[PDB]
């Protein structure tokens, strides 16, 4: 709920470049400034002879929102011989996937084609470039001597990537072995130390790779998506990967051991062609230090109230348990054909309540396919099934849908305000948007009505001016608040009380406030963080018995408190927000004594 949607940071790239197809954070290992990494896989480059080679842009923060390309490779195509190119970089989609860990940045071109040295071919093996700092090396683990579709010639290595916490790479190649797909994992140390530009197929020791299997597994697309997380409690991140054509289009998700690529766990979809496995994510969502698996099936069809199938998408949440099992739950999309679940982004603890949170994108929902992103907060039982926030794209396109939410990245506190922030790409409008998380104020409110029971016959209070004898009682409302992260010391609260709120339009209200002789009482207030329970008392009374003949329904004393957000701003311009999970209304009720 605490993401700032009023003034996000908006970044654009060249028209038609698919700027925003992939997004990440960059946190260099010098406690330096932080940047955004945005993939623009159809962008034109200065590489001689290359058309739409793609690029990865580094975008500054709070310095006029400027992006400059990262020079991974300035060169065009190498030649095997005169007029015989060794490789083909045009339309290679460099920047389709970008991942960064500390100093290192990994970006891949899943449609890079390579000729091979024996014959004239154009095999989309894919290639990646790894920039560790001053040094940049190529990393094309599928550009091997295992040629052709039956080998790794159509592997499209780099289709999906990730880093393990121990600086291993996880690479997905959905085309290997007649589209069985393949996962490959190499130590970054190997990737840079074994790099020799004179050798096109590099022998990395300690490489982990899935193996060719029986033909029945063809056309499964292993490596369509990947995530990492420990799932046998040995501290070594394991490999999660979506396999969306597996099990005759039901889809599957494989988990392999991050130490030997042994198979650990499997998930299987429930519906034909729901594209189960289009996206995967691993994050502890319920605060037990056991990573939990999220699997998106964007084309999943639901049964509607009328019994008609309706394509809304579905995400499954699998809570890891020490016993090795998983505790699975399903989450359904909201709009037809919106493809809820195309992207799943761990957010970290967005609201800093103790449980991590997650964003799930519906890139084709909203008005005129503008796209929608749903925020789901975690809790000890799992994921909160009702989204606490709804982000909506703001741009339309005249060619391809904006696809706001197609890519997302969170879990990085870019502005150092104490809460992680979210990047959302919208490649159909060549846009990427950073949403900063506002801080959260938790408020403890108490309301006391004494005496609880009211006797009409008992009158001890005098009315304002020159009037006498009204049955009275005391209403005391109290307020206390605190917050985490950069916050103002003083907070301006506005409180309102309503006596006998039960009685709606056209019905008599039996209780009135002494001074005001009205059933409502407003009150501005001011409380400081971590301060004491600043209270305030006022006195109410009852109407003459002659005016109301309902003495049976209780008299509820309703209290509301809200905040004016403009006054609490920061140097960032970031107003704090009230904790949405604690209700901002409280009510007690008094009763008329009967005889």
């Amino acid at each position, epitope marked *: 709920f605490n993401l700032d949607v009023d003034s996000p940071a908006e970044y654009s790239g060249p028209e038609g470049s698919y700027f925003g197809f992939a997004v990440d954070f960059f946190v260099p290992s010098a406690s330096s400034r932080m940047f955004l990494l945005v993939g623009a896989p159809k962008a034109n480059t200065t590489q001689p002879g290359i058309v739409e080679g793609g690029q990865v842009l580094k975008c500054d923060w709070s310095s006029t929102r400027r992006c400059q390309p990262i020079e991974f490779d300035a060169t065009g195509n190498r030649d095997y*011989a005169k007029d015989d190119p060794l490789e083909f970089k045009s339309h290679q989609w460099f920047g389709a996937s970008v991942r960064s860990k500390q100093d290192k940045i990994l970006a891949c071109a899943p449609l890079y084609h390579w000729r091979t*040295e024996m014959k004239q071919e154009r095999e989309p093996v894919g290639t990646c470039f790894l920039q560790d700092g001053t040094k940049t090396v190529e990393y094309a683990p599928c550009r*091997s*001597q*295992d*040629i052709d579709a*039956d*080998g*790794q010639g159509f592997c499209q290595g780099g289709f999906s990537i990730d880093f393990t916490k121990a600086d291993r790479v996880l690479l997905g190649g959905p085309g290997s072995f007649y589209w069985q797909g393949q996962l490959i994992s190499d130590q970054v140390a190997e990737i840079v130390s*074994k790099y*020799d530009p*004179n*050798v*096109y*197929s590099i*022998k*990395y*020791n300690n*490489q982990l*790779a899935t*193996r*060719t299997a029986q033909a029945i597994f063809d056309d499964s697309y292993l490596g369509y998506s990947v995530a990492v997380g420990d799932f046998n409690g040995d501290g070594i991140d394991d490999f999660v990967s979506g396999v969306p054509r597996a099990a005759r289009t039901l889809g599957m998700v494989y988990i392999y051991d991050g130490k030997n690529m042994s198979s650990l766990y499997n998930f299987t979809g429930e519906q034909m062609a729901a594209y189960f496995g289009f996206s995967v994510a691993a994050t502890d969502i319920n605060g037990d230090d056991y990573a939990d698996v999220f699997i998106g099936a964007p084309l999943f069809m639901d049964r509607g109230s009328d019994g008609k199938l309706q394509e809304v998408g579905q995400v499954s949440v699998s809570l890891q348990r020490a016993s090795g099992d998983f505790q699975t739950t399903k989450l359904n999309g909201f709009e037809v054909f919106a493809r809820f679940g195309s992207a799943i982004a761990p957010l970290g603890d967005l609201d800093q309540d103790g449980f991590n949170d997650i964003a799930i994108a519906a890139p084709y929902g909203g008005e005129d396919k503008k796209g929608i992103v749903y925020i789901f907060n975690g809790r000890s039982t799992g994921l909160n099934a009702v989204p606490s926030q709804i982000l909506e794209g703001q741009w339309a396109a005249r060619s391809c849908p904006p696809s706001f939410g197609y890519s997302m990245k969170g879990a990085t506190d870019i502005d150092k305000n104490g809460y992680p922030d979210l990047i959302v790409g919208a490649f159909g409008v060549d846009r990427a948007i950073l949403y900063r998380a506002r801080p959260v104020i938790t408020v403890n409110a108490g309301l006391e009505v004494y005496p609880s029971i009211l006797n009409q016959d008992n009158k001890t209070c005098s009315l304002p001016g020159t009037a006498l004898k009204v049955s009275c009682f005391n209403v005391r409302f109290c307020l206390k608040a605190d917050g985490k992260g950069v916050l103002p010391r003083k907070l301006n609260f506005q409180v309102e009380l309503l006596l006998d709120k039960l009685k709606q339009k056209g019905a008599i209200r039996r209780a009135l406030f002494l001074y005001s002789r009205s059933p409502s009482h407003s009150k501005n207030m001011t409380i400081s963080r971590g301060g004491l329970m600043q209270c305030e008392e006022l006195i109410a009374y009852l109407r003459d018995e002659s005016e109301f003949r309902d003495k049976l329904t209780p008299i509820t004393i309703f209290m509301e408190y809200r905040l004016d957000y403009r006054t609490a701003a920061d140097t960032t311009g970031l107003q704090p927000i009230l904790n949405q999970f604690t209700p901002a209304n409280i009510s007690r009720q008094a009763h008329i004594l009967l005889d």
Partner: antibody
Amino acid sequence: QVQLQQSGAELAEPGASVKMSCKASGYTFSSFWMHWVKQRPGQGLEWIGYINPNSGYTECNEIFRDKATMTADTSSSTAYMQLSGLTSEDSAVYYCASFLGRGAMDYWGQGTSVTVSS
Amino acid sequence: DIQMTQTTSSLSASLGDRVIISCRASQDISNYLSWYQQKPDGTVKLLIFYTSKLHSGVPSRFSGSGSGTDYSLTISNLDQEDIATYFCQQGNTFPYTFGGGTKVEMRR
């Protein structure tokens, strides 16, 4: 830390067959071709051919077409060669060598001597 | 098939000397020539590939040059452990073919 370990010396009578192994370690055995080289005592290096371990496809020098058949067990990262119809002219050291690319073989086994006598 | 020929089958050299080993191909092999060292005990190493590319792990003393049909390996500052036999090998066309070799022995 690439290493190719070849099986021990082989003795076979004339007309028999032998089969030697070459176990790879330190790289992904499936992603690289394995070559085979013949060297007679005091003589030079002769090229037999190569195998694509993941597909079983092979190409041979015309000399050794009928004489040698190459195979590969990917589960054990082992390439095998079998010599058949053995003569005294087959007595030699037989090397396995991984394929670097660029028309070169970057790592060599220690060789397996084959002696053919009665 | 391409015939490779190392005209000198053997040569002598003292420590520190520069040894230049020659190799010639019957046809143009488009700079696809490699050099291998074989030691007395049968050990074989790759030294140079694609005419002038140094294989990882081998010392900078070894270097290779050439084009078209004529190529040469060069040992600068001959080390004791360089006493060996050196073969050239074209990789431009199948079948791969070697030169006869050139033995290097210490002068005495």
